[PDB]
Design an enzyme around this catalytic site. Structure first.
Site, PDB file in Angstrom:
ATOM      1  N   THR F   1     -22.259   3.684 -17.051  1.00 35.42           N
ATOM      2  CA  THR F   1     -22.414   5.097 -17.371  1.00 35.42           C
ATOM      3  C   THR F   1     -21.057   5.762 -17.571  1.00 35.42           C
ATOM      4  OG1 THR F   1     -24.517   5.328 -16.176  1.00 35.42           O
ATOM      5  CG2 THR F   1     -23.247   7.334 -16.575  1.00 35.42           C
ATOM      6  N   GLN F   2     -20.835   6.302 -18.770  1.00 34.33           N
ATOM      7  CA  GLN F   2     -19.587   7.001 -19.050  1.00 34.33           C
ATOM      8  C   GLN F   2     -19.656   8.456 -18.602  1.00 34.33           C
ATOM      9  OE1 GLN F   2     -17.599   4.600 -19.941  1.00 34.33           O
ATOM     10  NE2 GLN F   2     -19.412   3.303 -20.209  1.00 34.33           N
TER      11      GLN F   2
END
Lengths: 236, 250, 201, 65, 197, 214, 213, 243, 238
Positions: F1-2
């Site tokens: 997850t960025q």
């Protein structure tokens, strides 16, 4: 007649056919003798020259795996080439990774792990289609002192005090049983090895009919020269 | 799986490759292809085995295929394998031209196709191509050339050679009649006509049963052309006239 | 870092400093910047210590394998070419190596400069590192092919000493090696303070 | 970023930077990277705190407006 | 920056290059050969990025020698130049591009002398004379002014000396010595180095 | 997850004599917006382990699914071996480090509480793979607001009873509600003991607002 | 964006004696301006003669220690013997260089006994550049402690001083004092000092409290 | 994708495919190589002369590099493949090592390739034997011989192909240090060895010569016929010394 | 016949002959005995020497600190299986920081060895293992077969002439449970000696002992560490 079965079928006796056939193929090779003493290890192989036009110096049945390890081979030497290359690469990889020398047992184990890696199905291209047809005598000196190992295409490898491989391995082993003792010196081992080779060889033993190498504590792998061989064969 | 395998790429107890020999038998069952090398050119003379009154007229040639601007080939054996091999030959020639911006020498093209044939005869488990090829061409290194290739992958240069039906008799005739260094395209055409006449003994020679193609150099260009029906008819008429003259003079 | 090597009538003289820096902090003053690849081959460290050490150890492994396979020692040109081909595969990925491969083979004394950028040039005198300009000046002022062995030792020591004097990333001690026909020898390892006492005094 | 090595050890001038030994703490690793505006209702202007000046964060890390 | 120059006459090609290998502000080598012998009558001159030059030149050299070994005859200078251009163009968009500037000089038994110009983008141009590097700007005008298609090898050497003297006078870089070679029907002949002590 | 989308705030952990207690609010925030006010950020792993997480809620749901499947498989074997809280903590550390090493981290900071063989376990795992054990834990803003109080109490009294631990947890929750802008006044308290894992909620903290008249 | 690294503090010190090796570290784990925990020692026992100290990014430290343990077990299985200190150092150098383009943010110091029984100390940079030393300080307070070890252990910049061989008691006292000074001046060092003493009779651990501010 | 094991062991310990490849070699034309002091001579028999064939295209002697050349007996196409691979290896070694290959190195490469083809899935061993000759950097003449199994040896003189046994016996009876004293003597010895199995008296002989630091040279039929005439003259000299 | 050459061919009797041939391969090896008490698991292996001048082949191998095995059959297959088990144990310790349970390792071995028995061109593993382990469930003795079937055993013997050893283990299973370490090792040694002919006796050269327990890691006693266990053994009852 030779394609009725796959390369990985068991016999009713519990033996792989191809491995037994490779064991049979070994018995057609020239005799090699290894003797392990407290002073070092000596390896002696019959060169078995076929024609006088041939150059005996081009026959290499004893090779240097590393400075402290030597290998004697019997059977199909062209099959032993790749195993010897693998052994050398393994020793160099171990030196690179750990900054130390391999033990003879670990080298023999690494070479023996390649013996049964053959098969048609579930195999990458370039994989072995059959077992190797060579028996290897590994002699070297490590922290446990001089050691001699024997390997066969079954993948089995054992430590040996004195062993013979090849066509005359039966008669030589019986001769090895009598002459060998624990307190044997390196010179006595070399003399007994040459005596047994002379007994089992068809041709007369000379400085060009045989190879002889030694590994000793404090000294690298050393292949005997023609003058040293002449000196040893002077009185037998 | 093992039970159904034919083992097409294994040795025989006498050191022979059976599939290659059987493909060569297939070649021997095919139609006669003839090639003669002259001083001013080189020709191909194939026998038309596809003859029927309900067959349509051929587009360019039934058995002679142009490979590039400087080379042509003739095939004997399985026709569809020949189509595959000719497509591959054209691809190889175009690849060489792309890499070097020069037309490929003939021997390099023959070597590439023979390498493909040998690769099929050594590994893969596939049957070999049942095609023998005759190659004619011109290049800046060796001038006019004539090559023959086998399904085994063996090739060789020739001054005059024949493949297909009755090839041995044609080879003997060429050995008797070919003159090294003295051949012109006219004499080569006459020899080709007489050899085709004698070898095709069951069927009398006619322009509708043979195809002839020549390769010449015309002012720095290579000209590969197929002889028209009237030209082959004139050649056959000249051959018959010479035969009748010999009959009278004997 | 200052490493230098030059060829003369009695072989190849290899000298180096021993200071390793992390930014403006001296991490170590006892770095062995001359790598004993073999009893006949020497290498030098300049740039990344880990990079040079790892790739010259790989070169040593390759040379040992070559000797085992061919039953003959590798040549200086072949070893330098092997190292250059090894390091060219990672060009542009951040490797920083400048090394000199020195040895004696069938062609005589050998000296090649190999860097991570892909250069590989044979020459008579080389100097690599951040202090290489000062060492170049001193060595060029004092170099001659007809130098005596002690004179060559003094020249190499003096050049490295001047480089450490002028360069902030050079210091520690000067390690001197002499490559002869029957292998190299470790000549000495003199601290920079002792050299200052000898030269200024 | 801070894993640069050998740039300044090979040539005094040139784009490459770094010494002989890898040390992020000596090559500008953030360590405890805190915004100067942390603990403030408003963001500080660029250049408010000169480098090298004794600075006390207005709050812990994560309280940046 | 490195310097290459080629001059083609009625029956010869004359090439020269600087012998300087430079790192940062220091000349590391004073006698550095930039010419690669492709065949008995083909010379390849390569400059550009470090590493790329030697790798590409040796790859091309090995391929040309392999062609000669496989076929029994040698590649013509035109075919060798086209092969080099094809390989450089193929590498241009690949993951491993070579930044090299090339001059191909060769003599053909039938076509005669030939000189080819190739930039790092792999565009191939046949020229009567060509040059590479920053020194090309200062010498191409002299070549345009004084070159004639019937120039003899003596006058060609004189014109090359004029260009190198201009390089000595006006170029900011220190390029004191040059290696000079000539290709004709008898092969590649090494001429005396042109040096400015 | 960025970029985490829906996130949870601080999660607290505290060891007492007989087990561990874990507290987390029931709010999932979409940035500054309190969007999901009835979500559970505490999961029961097995009969001896519980888990609470901060950060991206979707990643927490994914990890909950994977851990539940692992527990189901291990109970399917039925050979008498069950994952200990320490084993769950180690597996979580390995997973977080593997995700971080691929530049695809699980944007979460998780608290692992457990009770096995008569000893309490409290473990911390973050999105980078940093893991450790401590007698008390607090993620996010609780590391600054709740951890000092727990540490002060544990320095005065190293060993707490269950009632004292719950009271201290309630005080820390009240402080977090006072001072954290991403928190909510609706939380759960999960306890693990020799009897198993018990999750209580929703609960509210009593708040004083008499300083508004000052 | 996303940062795969963090600095968790920790100073590691090793001193090699004539027949002993000492590896010492603080037990404080931190991140930013906060303290993760006050009991997180950086010293790990590898064999009966080798102790490693790892500081820096704590996740990398955990992974590297676990990988080293697995590789030691693999070596023992394959070679029927335990790894030596130098073999461990070379293997760790290879392991660290295996991640050259995504390095382990770990400061590694290996302390133990060599094959002759003498104390051996190896210092590692994050990409595997290592050398044998007699004493070394690594971590957040390495720059503070290294000059003092040079002055006191190496007797550098001193005259008319006999280079007496370093004894176990003097080395232990020196380690304790230097860590007290580091805890005074370094914000990442404190809350305890753990000392591992490697002798031929085994490995002995000791704990010394530091200031908690 | 074909992964059948073609070369497998027989109950007696024999690899039947390798033996059949050796039998295929035994059917090839005789190739003779003799090592001299300053020269190496390779002689190959032509099984048949067609009188219509371009001889340049069917040569059994080829150069692998500027110092190494080889002859073969067996399957021509397999030999062509092996020669191409050996040439590529020679170029690669000249690239990486910056030195020309030795005869032993290329012989080892060829033998290893053959052994690989004797122990890999889905392929059959090569049906050729090779006689690799050349000069090392120090100038030492070399003669090696490979077989389908992948084993190689160094020789002073050897013969492969059909009738190789009788030619090898002739070489054993005739190879002496005084029989290779001069280059012409070595050439005559090779031609005499070939004449023990071939007909037409030198017309069916393709002869090649390689000298120290010189390119491989192929004798034209005129030179071969001159040497054959000289050999007949020496036969008449032996006749006159008999009586 | 035509059903005994492939592992993918059923017989008209519902049997696969290649698997039985691999079981014969296991029966060809030298005898080894495994047995367990309440607190310890012991493997005693009868080593064999190719010749009087050859060392006796290794039969007991280290897998993990709590698991060891004794092999009977193809040695290369045994080494492959041992490497697989070592990797599985290392993975377990890396991921969960706990020793892998013995039963789960044996399940993994069975799953791995089942695959070659159903695919064309593969062969069964021609080795049989006796596995001694200790975990939270206590000591365990396991036996694996080329048929990929595995058994949880109170005691077991595999190899040549193992029927007599199995009979002795059957006789003394009632007292195997309460024995101490020395008594259990002596029971195992007597069971192994039951496989030996009368003229042959147990000595320090052909006996290998592997022990694992609650407070004892897996240890192998081979040559001089065997003498304390051999001492006290009575003469053969005949």
């Amino acid at each position: 007649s030779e394609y009725d079965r796959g390369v990985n079928t068991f016999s009713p006796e519990g033996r792989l056919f191809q491995v037994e056939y490779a064991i049979e193929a070994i018995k057609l090779g020239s005799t090699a003798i290894g003797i392990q003493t407290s002073e070092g290890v000596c390896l002696a192989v019959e060169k078995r020259i076929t024609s006088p036009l041939m150059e005996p110096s081009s026959i290499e049945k004893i090779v240097e795996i590393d400075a402290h390890i030597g290998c004697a081979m019997s059977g199909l030497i062209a099959d032993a080439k790749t195993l010897i290359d693998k052994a050398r690469v393994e020793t160099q990889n171990h030196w690179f990774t750990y900054n130390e020398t391999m033990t003879v047992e670990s080298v023999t184990q690494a070479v023996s792990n390649l013996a049964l890696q053959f098969g048609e199905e579930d195999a990458d291209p370039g994989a072995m289609s059959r077992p190797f047809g060579v028996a290897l005598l590994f002699g070297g000196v490590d922290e446990k002192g001089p050691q001699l190992f024997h390997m066969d295409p079954s993948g089995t490898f054992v430590q040996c005090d004195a062993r013979a491989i090849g066509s005359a391995s039966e008669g030589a082993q019986s001769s090895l049983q009598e002459v060998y003792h624990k307190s044997m010196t390196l010179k006595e081992a070399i003399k007994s090895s040459l005596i047994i080779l002379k007994q089992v060889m068809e041709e007369k033993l000379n400085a060009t009919n045989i190879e002889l190498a030694t590994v000793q504590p404090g000294q690298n792998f050393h292949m005997f020269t023609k003058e040293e061989l002449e000196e040893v064969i002077k009185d037998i | 799986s093992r039970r159904y395998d034919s083992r097409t790429t294994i040795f025989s107890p006498e050191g022979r490759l059976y599939q290659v020999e059987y493909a060569m038998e297939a070649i021997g069952h095919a139609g006669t292809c003839l090639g003669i090398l002259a001083n001013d050119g080189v020709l191909l003379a194939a026998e038309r085995r596809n003859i029927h009154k309900l067959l349509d007229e051929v587009f360019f040639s039934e058995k002679i295929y142009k490979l590039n601007e400087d080379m042509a080939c003739s095939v004997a054996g399985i026709t569809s394998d020949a189509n595959v091999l000719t497509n591959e030959l054209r691809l190889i020639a175009q690849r060489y031209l792309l890499q070097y911006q020069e037309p490929i020498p003939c021997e390099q093209l023959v070597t590439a196709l023979c390498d493909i044939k040998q690769a099929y005869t050594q590994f893969g488990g596939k049957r070999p191509f049942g095609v023998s090829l005759l190659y004619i061409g011109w290049d800046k290194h060796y001038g006019f050339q004539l090559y023959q290739s086998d399904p085994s992958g063996n090739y060789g240069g020739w001054k005059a050679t024949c493949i297909g039906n009755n090839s041995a008799a044609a080879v003997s005739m060429l050995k008797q009649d070919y003159k090294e260094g003295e051949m012109t395209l006219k004499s080569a055409l006459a020899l080709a006509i007489k050899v085709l006449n004698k070898t095709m003994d069951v069927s009398k020679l006619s322009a509708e049963k043979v195809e002839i193609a020549t390769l010449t150099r015309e002012n720095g260009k290579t000209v590969i052309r197929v002889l028209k029906q009237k030209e082959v008819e004139q050649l056959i008429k000249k051959h018959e006239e010479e035969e009748a003259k010999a009959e009278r003079e004997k | 870092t200052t490493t230098l090597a030059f060829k003369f009538r009695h072989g190849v003289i290899v000298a180096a400093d021993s200071r390793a820096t992390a930014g403006a902090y001296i991490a170590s003053q006892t770095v062995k910047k001359v790598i004993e690849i073999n009893p006949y081959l020497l290498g030098t460290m300049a740039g990344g210590a880990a990079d040079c050490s790892f790739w010259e150890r790989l070169l040593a492994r390759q040379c040992r394998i070559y000797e085992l396979r061919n039953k003959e020692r590798i040549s200086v040109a072949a070893a330098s070419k092997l190292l250059a081909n090894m390091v060219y595969q990672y060009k542009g990925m951040g490797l920083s190596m400048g090394t000199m491969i020195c040895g004696w083979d069938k062609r005589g004394p050998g000296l090649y400069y190999v860097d991570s950028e892909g250069n590989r040039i044979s020459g008579a005198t080389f100097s690599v590192g951040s202090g290489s300009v000062y060492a170049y000046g001193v060595m060029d002022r004092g170099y001659s092919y007809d130098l005596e062995v002690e004179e060559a030792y003094d020249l190499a020591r003096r050049a490295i000493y001047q480089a450490t004097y002028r360069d902030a990333y050079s210091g520690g001690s000067v390690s001197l090696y002499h490559v002869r026909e029957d292998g190299w020898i470790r000549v000495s390892s003199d601290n920079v303070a002792d050299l200052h006492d000898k030269y200024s005094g | 970023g801070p894993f640069v090595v050998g740039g300044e050890d090979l040539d005094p001038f040139g784009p490459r930077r770094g010494g002989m030994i890898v040390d992020p703490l000596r090559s500008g690793f953030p360590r405890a990277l805190i915004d100067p505006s942390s603990g403030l209702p408003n963001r500080l202007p660029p250049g408010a705190v000169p480098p090298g000046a004794r600075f006390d964060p207005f709050g812990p890390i994560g309280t940046s407006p | 920056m490195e310097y290459l120059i080629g001059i083609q006459g009625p029956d010869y090609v004359l090439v020269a290059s600087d012998r300087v290998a430079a790192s940062n502000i220091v000349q590391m080598k004073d006698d550095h050969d930039k010419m690669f012998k492709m065949s008995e009558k083909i010379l390849l001159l390569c400059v550009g990025e470090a590493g790329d030059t030697v790798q590409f030149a040796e790859y091309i050299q090995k391929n040309v020698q392999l062609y000669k070994m496989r076929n029994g005859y040698e590649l013509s200078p035109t075919a060798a130049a086209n092969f080099t251009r094809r390989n450089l163009a193929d590498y241009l968009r690949s993951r491993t591009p070579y930044h090299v500037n090339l001059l191909l000089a060769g003599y053909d038994e039938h076509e005669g002398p030939a000189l080819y110009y190739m930039d790092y983008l792999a565009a191939l141009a046949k020229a009567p004379f060509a040059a590479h590097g920053y020194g090309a700007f200062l010498t191409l005008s002299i070549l345009d002014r004084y070159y004639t298609p019937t120039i003899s090898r003596e006058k060609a050497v004189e014109l090359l000396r004029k260009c190198l003297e201009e390089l000595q006078k006006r170029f900011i870089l220190n390029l004191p010595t040059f290696s000079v070679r000539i290709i004709d029907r008898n092969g590649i002949h090494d001429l005396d180095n042109i040096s400015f002590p | 997850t960025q970029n985490p989308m829906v996130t949870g705030t601080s999660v607290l952990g505290l060891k007492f004599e007989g087990g561990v207690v874990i507290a987390a609010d029931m709010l999932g925030s979409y940035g500054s917006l309190a969007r999901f006010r009835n979500i559970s950020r505490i999961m029961r792993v097995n009969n001896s382990t519980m888990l609470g997480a901060s950060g991206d809620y979707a990643d927490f749901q994914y990890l909950k699914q994977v851990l539940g499947q692992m527990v189901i498989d291990e109970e399917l074997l039925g050979d008498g071996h069950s994952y200990s809280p320490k084993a769950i903590h180690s597996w979580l550390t390995r997973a977080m480090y593997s995700r971080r090493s691929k530049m695809n981290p699980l944007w979460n900071t998780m608290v692992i509480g457990g009770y096995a063989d008569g000893e309490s376990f409290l473990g911390y795992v973050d999105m980078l793979g940093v893991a450790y054990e401590a007698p008390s834990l607090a993620t996010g803003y609780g590391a600054y607001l709740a951890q000092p109080l727990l540490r002060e109490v544990l320095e005065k009294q190293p060993v707490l009873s269950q009632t004292e631990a719950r009271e201290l947890v309630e005080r820390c929750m009240r402080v977090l509600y006072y001072r954290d802008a991403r928190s909510y006044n609706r939380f759960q308290i999960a306890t693990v003991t020799e009897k198993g894992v018990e999750i209580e909620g929703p609960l509210s903290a009593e708040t004083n607002w008499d300083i508004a008249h000052m | 964006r996303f940062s795969p690294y963090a600095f968790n503090g920790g100073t590691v010190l090793a001193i090699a004696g004539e027949d002993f090796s000492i590896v010492a570290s603080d037990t404080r784990l931190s991140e930013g301006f906060s303290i993760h925990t006050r009991d997180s020692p950086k010293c790990y026992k590898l064999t009966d003669k080798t102790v490693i100290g790892c500081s820096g990014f704590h996740g990398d430290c955990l992974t590297l220690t676990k990988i080293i343990e697995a590789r030691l077990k693999m070596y023992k299985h394959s070679n029927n013997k335990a790894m030596t200190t130098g073999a461990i150092a070379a293997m760790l150098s290879t392991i660290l260089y295996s991640r050259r383009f995504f390095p382990y943010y770990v400061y590694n110091i290996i302390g133990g006994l060599d094959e002759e029984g003498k104390g051996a100390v190896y210092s590692f940079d994050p990409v595997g550049s290592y050398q044998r030393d007699s004493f070394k300080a690594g971590g957040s307070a390495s720059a503070m402690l290294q000059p003092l070890l040079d002055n006191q252990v190496g007797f550098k910049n001193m005259q008319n001083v006999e280079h007496v061989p370093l004894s176990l008691d003097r080395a232990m006292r020196l380690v304790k004092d230097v860590f007290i000074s580091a805890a005074e001046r370094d914000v990442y060092t404190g809350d305890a000092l753990k000392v591992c003493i490697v002798t031929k009779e085994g490995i002995r651990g000791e704990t010394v409290p530091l200031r908690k501010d | 994708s074909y992964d059948r094991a073609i070369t497998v062991f027989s109950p007696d310990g024999h690899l039947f495919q390798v033996e059949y490849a050796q039998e295929a070699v035994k059917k090839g034309s005789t190739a003779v190589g003799v090592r001299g002091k300053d020269i190496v001579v390779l002689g190959v028999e032509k099984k048949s002369v067609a009188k219509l064939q371009d001889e340049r295209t069917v040569r059994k002697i080829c150069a692998l590099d500027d110092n190494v050349c080889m002859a073969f007996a067996g399957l021509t196409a397999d030999a062509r493949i092996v020669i191409n691979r050996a040439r590529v290896e020679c170029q690669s070694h000249r690239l990486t090592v910056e030195d020309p290959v030795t005869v032993e190195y290329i012989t080892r490469y060829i033998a290893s390739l053959k052994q690989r083809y004797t122990q890999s899935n889905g392929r059959r061993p090569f049906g050729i034997s090779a006689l690799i000759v050349g000069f090392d950097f120090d100038g030492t003449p070399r003669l090696y011989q490979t077989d389908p199994s992948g084993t190689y040896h160094a020789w002073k003189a050897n013969a492969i192909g059909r009738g190789a046994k009788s030619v090898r016996e002739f070489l054993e009876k005739n190879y002496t240090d005084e029989a290779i004293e001069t280059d012409d003597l070595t050439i005559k010895l090779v031609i005499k060895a070939l004449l023990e199995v071939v007909q037409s008296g030198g017309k069916n002989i393709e002869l090649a010569v390689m000298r120290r630091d010189q390119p491989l040279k192929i004798l034209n039929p005129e030179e071969i016929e001159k040497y054959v005439a000289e050999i007949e003259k020496e036969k008449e000299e032996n006749e006159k010394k008999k009586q | 016949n035509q059903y005994d050459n492939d592992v993918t061919v059923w017989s008209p009797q519902g049997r696969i002959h290649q698997i039985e041939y691999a079981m014969e391969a296991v029966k060809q090896g030298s005898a080894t005995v495994g047995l367990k008490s309440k607190t310890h698991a012991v493997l005693v292996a009868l080593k064999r020497a190719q010749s009087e001048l050859a060392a006796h082949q290794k039969k007991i191998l280290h897998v993990d600190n709590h698991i060891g095995i004794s092999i009977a059959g193809l040695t290369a297959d045994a080494r492959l299986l041992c490497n697989f088990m070592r990797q599985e144990c290392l993975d377990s310790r890396f991921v969960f920081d706990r020793p892998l349970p013995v039963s789960r390792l044996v399940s993994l071995i069975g799953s791995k060895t089942q695959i070659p028995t159903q695919r064309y061109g593969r062969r069964p593993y021609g080795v049989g293992l006796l596995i001694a382990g200790y975990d939270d469930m206590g000591p365990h003795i396991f036996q694996t077969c080329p048929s990929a079937n595995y058994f949880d055993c109170r005691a077991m013997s595999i190899g040549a002439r193992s029927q007599s050893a199995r009979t002795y283990l059957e006789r003394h299973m009632s007292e195997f449970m309460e024995c101490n370490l020395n008594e259990l090792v002596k029971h195992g040694l007597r069971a192994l000696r039951e496989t030996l002919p009368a003229e042959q006796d147990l000595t320090t050269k052909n006996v290998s002992i592997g022990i694992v327990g609650k407070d004892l890691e897996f240890t192998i006693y081979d040559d001089d560490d065997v003498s304390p266990f051999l001492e006290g053994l009575e003469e053969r009852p005949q």
